[PDB]
Paper text:
Pol III is a multi-subunit complex composed of 17 subunits. The TFIIF-like RPC4/5 and the TFIIE-like RPC3/6/7 subcomplexes are Pol III specific and can be regarded as built-in general transcription factors that play a fundamental role in Pol III transcription initiation and termination. A notable exception is the subunit [name], which in metazoans encompasses a long C-terminal extension (RPC5EXT, ~450 residues long), whose function is currently unknown.
To gain insight into the structure and function of RPC5EXT, we determined the structure of its individual domains by X-ray crystallography. This arrangement is likely caused by the crystallization conditions and, in agreement with this hypothesis, SAXS data showed a monomeric conformation as the most likely in solution. Nevertheless, the two possible conformations of [name], compact or elongated, suggests a degree of flexibility within this domain. In addition, the Dali server analysis retrieved similarities between the individual WHDs of RPC5EXT [name] and the WHDs of cullin and cullin-like proteins, which are involved in ubiquitin-dependent proteolysis. Several abundant phosphorylation sites have been identified in RPC5EXT, which, together with the evidence of structural similarities between RPC5EXT [name] and factors involved in targeted degradation, suggests the intriguing hypothesis of an RPC5EXT-mediated layer of regulation impacting overall Pol III abundance in response to environmental cues that may have evolved in higher organisms.
Author numbering:
A (entry chain B), B (entry chain A): 554 to 708
Write the structure that this text describes.
Amino acid sequence: APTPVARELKAFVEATFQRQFVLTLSELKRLFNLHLASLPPGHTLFSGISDRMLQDTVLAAGCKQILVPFPPQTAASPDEQKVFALWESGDMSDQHRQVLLEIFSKNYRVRRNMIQSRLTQECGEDLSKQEVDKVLKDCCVSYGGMWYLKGTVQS
Amino acid sequence: APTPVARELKAFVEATFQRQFVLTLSELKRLFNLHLASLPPGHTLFSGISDRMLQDTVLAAGCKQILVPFPPQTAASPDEQKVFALWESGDMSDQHRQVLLEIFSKNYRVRRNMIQSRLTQECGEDLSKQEVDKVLKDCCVSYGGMWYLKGTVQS
């Protein structure tokens, strides 16, 4: 079957705006071409990607167009005048920490997998290794293969 | 001393939990004593601060007590068994960015002071230079003493 483009575009747009926050369509297209250089031949993003699809991906990913009023005599191109910005950053680190703390309301120590499973069940199956690693680094210490809240191990 | 006790203690507790996330009372007291070592004689925080007031300040700041079930045979002291945790970061990055972005919906370029004043008016005087510097670094570029959204200067 066909290999759809939307998820691949979204991953690129999300990485780009989380890093840079504000950029023009011109810069987004430049960065997209650099992204293409990293992809293997046969990838779906080598064909049939319009500027419209890129803009729709930006708006689908919690970014907004900022209607900056360029001066009358500007030489900036249309793409150089179209400005997008990260609106909501989507950092759910507070919520992950709250789920972990709820575990330790009922447990002194647990396996990593128990934490991962609880987070996945509560917060979503797309939870990343980086997000779990962060909440563990912030809140916990491991001893003997078990995970404790910081400062609660008595070795 | 020159400043109010609870206000000063609250500032210390907030900064400490934003850095450490999870602390026992024992560890919080250790960190407090390290803090006192840095302060000038006559500072209000050399006043008697009871453990109860310290805990009350943590709880009043929005940190939560975590009722971790310590094992029956633990040798942890009572203060080592009282666990507290940051519930919300207080990261207001998105809101500051949205204030700034609305400035550039009506302006191509502005002075830094204009952005600062707008942030102060919308958020309040409780914006650290660190937050203002961050929102400027994330969204903007300076050229000739004026501030623009990233990517919009025709350099």
